[PDB]
Design a protein around this nucleic acid. Structure first.
Ligand SMILES: [Mg+2]
Ligand SMILES: [Mg+2]
Ligand SMILES: [Mg+2]
Lengths: 442, 284, 442, 284
DNA sequence: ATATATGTGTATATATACACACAT
DNA sequence: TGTGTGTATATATACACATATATA
């Protein structure tokens, strides 16, 4: 018994605040640079761990989850499964970061199969766009093995469309076409006026327009005759079930329309026959308005661009193009850090290779007689306190097929190649490297 | 008007409609996009089907899946599923070099399509009128491509294609359990209306060619004959790509189930409450 | 469109028969030697795979059961999680093959926590009994990554107690004490009258009385003064919930008994007081019989020993001693297989070490010169001379530091001790090695 | 008569009975083995608790684990949880060097135990009689170690100690929600009857000894101050603990909840329709 | 002036098969 | 006649969070 007195103000200010802010920074509000919520980041990190051995192998979605627990995801594996199932689709993602094998859901029915059937792997889009994985920032807590955020070439957050919800805050970003985002990023790189990205929903054949900052998503319908119509498209928010049970069951029950189903390969294709109980005024504008209103082919959504900046704090943007003019700037510094790290690594590798070649030449020339001496003193001997004394243990561990002349010149060739690579890395700029990495995205 | 029913546009109409009985919601999502949109249905069951053998209809229509199968297809327990036309003049013709004896109100299965006797008569095909007393009924009932035309039906649908997974459970505890449940209407089996969609259990591709093995036993008989391959054992119907699903739906390999003369004892052996029959049957 | 007519007889004889044989062999009935249903051996194989790096590391139950489909499991991972939760505890396991931290249930609450919480790892008992994992049979299917069956030393199937139901057949084997199963295996090994083993239940403090095949597991009671009694132990069948709701609840709302709960840390403690409405009398025998019958303090279990033999076929035994004799006969051959494989491996390693010693001795002095050579000529020279060709990898695996001192003595000592080890493997027989291994179990 | 309830032996009688509301069966499995069989109850909730601010006392009893709590603890909405003893003679004494003014029928919290005024008087403790008009009620109300004796009551358990998963969800989303629910009786947080059974969230095994961190915030204040710690993060309240459960139940660290003057404002800000107040709250 | 849906999280829970021996 | 055990098949529920549309 350790009875202590606690006040409600201290409980709310400490424990309730800790959860409420944790929900903001972890449960939702995807990172601006990453484009991932933490659960999706863990899922993709585990998928990369699995694909390390072979990137073309499909792994069970149950295998992608479950193992996320050791990486630092202490929030139950069902959420990880569900978040990994929402990333491997193509109807939901305009730029998927996981490839799938099985019934991952379609636009008609927006639910994936159970985790026991469908397989997932890291798609070619992730390898094409996401670079500098090894140079990603390290998370503050040691149990968070995945980095703070990956480093995509383009802001994947405005690519697939996020909808996060938190205590006090929420986010909603509409999908944008990959080509337009790439063009905007390139313009921001070169430092000119940047065109706003164009909203494009995946597997959607319709019209999306800008009206006073809103975004009206419209389907398409045509009249095959006086009384027959063909719903060629429906707004993106609708499934086959929540569209039928919301617009066509009430209309059929009221005895206004008689609808057939044609939701084939061409998305949704409902065919509607009108009765005399439905108004069919010959006015074109009025008829179009009535059809769009009763059939729910018009859906209005407004972006709530709330993200997490590079400093791990909530930030709210207003313009659609305001992540780009900041993501590009931070990614430039990160590419500069990559360049410096590569320069240091290449210099170290070239020095090691040159020292290796020099030691090989000295040992094949009889300067260092290996026979007739103990390993410890030989390490303490002329192999130490000399130009290659820093890599004495590495040289000592050399294998056999290097005294031979077959590889004696090969080591010198590799040292020269490393020096050339270091010279290349020194003779480069961050703008050129970033604009070269952008050409990979076709 | 059940919840998870993918209604065909000619359900309650006289047409060659089909109802697909997958055993889960994960097996149905890709079916929506690949139906005929006119003659194709769909209803997900829930795992292992209740052992329908031996219970009264009152307890039979208590499980949700059996009740929904009854509601969808229109089959009601204890009453038949369709009446046949009255027997009339018998006609014999030679189809593909084989003598076939039919009535004036029969259906002929030609190239996967059922054609009426009147249509064949209108197609300038020779018909031989034969007295009813001089007609071999045993040979008439042995022809799988000949079936009598129905006067009237209530089965909303015209075909019930049991399309379950090809795992051992799917083919052993669920397929010949829906078979036992549908055995309450033997007319469905007599008319060739209960079919099983052959879903591959193993899609082993070699080079750039994909091979489909519909049973594990089929795979083990060809494991050492095929070249090097990567076996893709699909656990359930929801693990098939959209391309393979559409190919196997639009180019189906059905298995029309017909019952032998001793089907009752065969079903009692596998479903009845007597483990000795199963013990004797398994050790052979 | 294909319409192939299929007879129901073929359906039952192929699909139903395959399913029934699958349930009997590869689902429910346990292996005679291993004692595992083929979902428990998958879990143990995966746990061993996870235990390669850190033996003592605890893995989440969603990580063990997760990713067992790559080992050949053809079913859902929830069944694997449930199977791994049952064998990772101590309340019903007389020989725990999995060690776990967390709430794996107890005798009172016979239900482990949700798999998101409880961790598990292979226990020291598995490493103590399960030997020669690499010499275990290879399963016919290439996808079956685990062996056909692991190779224990004592019959595990009799220790923990296995109950399974399949199509047409079912099994029920009571738990048996390890101390007595080891004695029975020792008698079978030496060859003598095999004493029948004693059935011992885990964490159970009562009396198991066997009359003829039937077992008569009893409980305990103690009359405090004249009417209040302390039920100190209930049979092993009962939970706490389905003992209260089964006996103690349908005894209080009947004017018969009033009870209190005292299920302490030792076990069950249902302290009971009797009211006036009771058929109790002075006679001791009828008192005891009525107390044991009314409170269900007697449970009866009859073994139905159905196991899969070493050939993969079902086998039904009449007593446990027959199972022990057959198991020891099967394991005696695998001990000899271990002897032969160790002999071959040791001979090959001895030849490799001798070749390495000869290389070191003949290159340090300067007979086999590698200076001014290439890979091809050196390999051809070493292959043309005898006793070097079969292990040309020794040429390149020596490394530079092995061309020194303080290593030729070491390598020669290794080669010499390899001769002693080979002689050790060439003299021991099955009986003595088996007895020596059995002497390490305690 | 709750199926999921672990009734205490002295529940419903006059003792220091305690309820131990968890948030799942997985967290209550070890309670029965380790709890005080005499005075310790338990009812596991079902995940997150319904937001119960501003709702009438007719939709509050629609959530299962808010009507069940009322059934167990005997509390009913809209009625006082108990009637206090009538005011009588007031007495003052020097307790541990502190002057404390009480009345002849209160209870004093000494060393984790509540002792009656009469018992203290019988224990050779000096008591000073003071006229009621000369007693400072403001001073008396501020004393957290003195509580009025209950004349009559229905609360089956005279303790509602809440214990939940120590993670963020169970500490900042379930604890304050249950606090807001129990605030419907703004007298439980007046005698120290609502407690929090503190539970480790992170366990370290530095050396051979075991060190407990109750909150992740506490852990991230000496993380770079411990030698060779290999933490075992605890998400389940009673599902990652084996013998730590017995230690933390038999030697519990309670935390009684005391409402400040403006508790309604705090509960509306944290649990209220206006989300702008929260945005103003987490921004500072 | 309400209803609602979006996506991580909190927990649980359901129907059905199979057999053999207690327990009715 | 009837729960009851353990591996399989498949499915499902309440609760929170906010904010911008549809409805009332
Ligand atoms: Mg399925
Ligand atoms: Mg818990
Ligand atoms: Mg919790």
């Amino acid at each position: 018994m350790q009875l202590n007195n606690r006040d409600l103000k201290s409980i709310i200010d400490n424990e309730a605040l800790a959860y409420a802010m944790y929900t903001v920074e972890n449960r939702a509000i995807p990172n601006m640079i990453d484009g991932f919520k933490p659960v999706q980041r863990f899922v993709i990190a585990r998928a990369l761990d699995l694909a390390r051995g072979n990137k073309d192998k499909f792994h069970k979605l149950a295998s992608i989850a479950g193992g996320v627990a050791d990486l630092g995801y202490h929030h139950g594996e069902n959420s990880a499964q569900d978040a990994g199932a929402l990333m491997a689709n193509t109807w939901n993602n305009n730029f998927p970061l996981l490839d799938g094998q099985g019934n991952f859901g379609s636009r008609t029915v927006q639910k994936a199969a159970a985790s026991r059937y469908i397989f997932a792997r890291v798609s070619k889009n992730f390898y094409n766009v996401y670079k500098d994985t090894e140079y990603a920032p390290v998370h503050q807590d040691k149990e968070h093995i995945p980095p703070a955020f990956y480093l995509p070439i383009i802001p994947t957050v405005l690519l697939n469309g996020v909808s996060g919800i938190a205590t006090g805050y929420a986010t909603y970003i509409l999908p944008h076409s990959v080509s337009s985002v790439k063009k905007a990023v390139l313009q921001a790189l070169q430092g000119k006026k940047v065109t706003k990205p164009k909203v494009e929903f995946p597997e959607f054949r319709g019209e999306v327009v800008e009206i006073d900052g809103q975004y009206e998503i419209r389907g398409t319908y045509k009249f095959t005759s006086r009384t027959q119509m063909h719903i060629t498209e429906i707004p993106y928010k609708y499934d086959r079930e929540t569209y039928v049970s919301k617009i066509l069951d009430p209309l059929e029950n009221k005895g206004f329309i008689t609808w057939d189903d044609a939701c084939g390969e061409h998305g949704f294709g409902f065919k509607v026959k009108f009765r005399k109980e439905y108004s069919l005024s010959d006015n074109e504008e009025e008829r179009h308005a009535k059809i769009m209103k009763d059939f729910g082919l018009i859906e209005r959504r407004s972006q709530n661009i709330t993200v997490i900046n590079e400093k791990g704090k909530l930030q709210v943007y207003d313009n659609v193009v305001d992540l780009i003019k900041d993501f590009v700037e931070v990614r430039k510094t990160y590419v500069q850090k990559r360049i410096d790290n590569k320069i240091k690594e290449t210099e170290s590798a070239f020095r090691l290779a040159f020292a290796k070649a020099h030691f090989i030449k000295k040992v094949i020339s009889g300067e260092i007689v290996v026979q007739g001496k103990t390993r410890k003193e030989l390490t303490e001997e002329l192999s130490k306190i000399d130009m290659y004394s820093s890599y004495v243990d590495k040289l000592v561990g050399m294998n056999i097929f290097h005294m031979t002349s077959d590889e004696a010149k090969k080591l010198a060739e590799e040292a020269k190649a490393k020096k050339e690579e270091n010279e290349y890395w020194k003779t480069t700029d961050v703008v050129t490297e970033y604009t070269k990495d952008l050409e990979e995205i076709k | 008007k059940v919840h998870k029913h993918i209604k065909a546009n000619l359900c309650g109409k006289d047409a060659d409609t089909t109802l697909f009985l997958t055993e889960g919601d994960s097996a149905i999502g890709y079916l929506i996009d690949v139906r005929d949109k006119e003659l194709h249905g769909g209803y997900p069951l829930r795992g292992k089907v209740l052992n329908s053998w031996g219970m009264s209809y009152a307890d039979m229509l208590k499980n949700k899946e059996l009740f929904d199968i009854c509601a969808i297809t229109g089959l009601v327990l204890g009453e038949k599923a369709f009446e046949e036309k009255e027997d009339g003049e018998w006609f014999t013709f030679e189809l593909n070099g084989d003598t076939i004896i039919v009535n004036e109100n029969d259906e002929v299965q030609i190239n996967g399509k059922w054609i009426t006797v009147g249509e064949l008569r209108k197609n300038l095909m020779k018909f031989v009128k034969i007295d009813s007393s001089s007609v071999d009924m045993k040979k008439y009932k042995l022809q799988n491509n000949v079936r009598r035309s129905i006067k009237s039906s209530s089965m909303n649908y015209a075909n019930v294609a049991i399309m379950t997974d090809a795992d051992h459970d799917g083919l052993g505890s669920i397929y010949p359990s829906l078979l036992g449940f549908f055995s309450n209407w033997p007319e469905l089996f007599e008319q060739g209306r209960i079919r099983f969609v052959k879903t591959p259990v193993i899609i082993a591709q070699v080079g750039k060619k994909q091979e489909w093995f519909y049973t594990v036993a089929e795979y083990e008989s060809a494991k050492d004959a095929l070249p090097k391959h990567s076996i893709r054992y699909i656990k359930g119907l929801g693990s098939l790509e959209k391309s393979e699903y559409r190919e196997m739906i639009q180019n189906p390999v059905y298995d029309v189930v017909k019952l032998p003369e001793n089907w009752k004892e065969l079903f009692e052996m596998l479903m009845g409450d007597n483990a000795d029959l199963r013990k004797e049957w398994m050790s052979q």
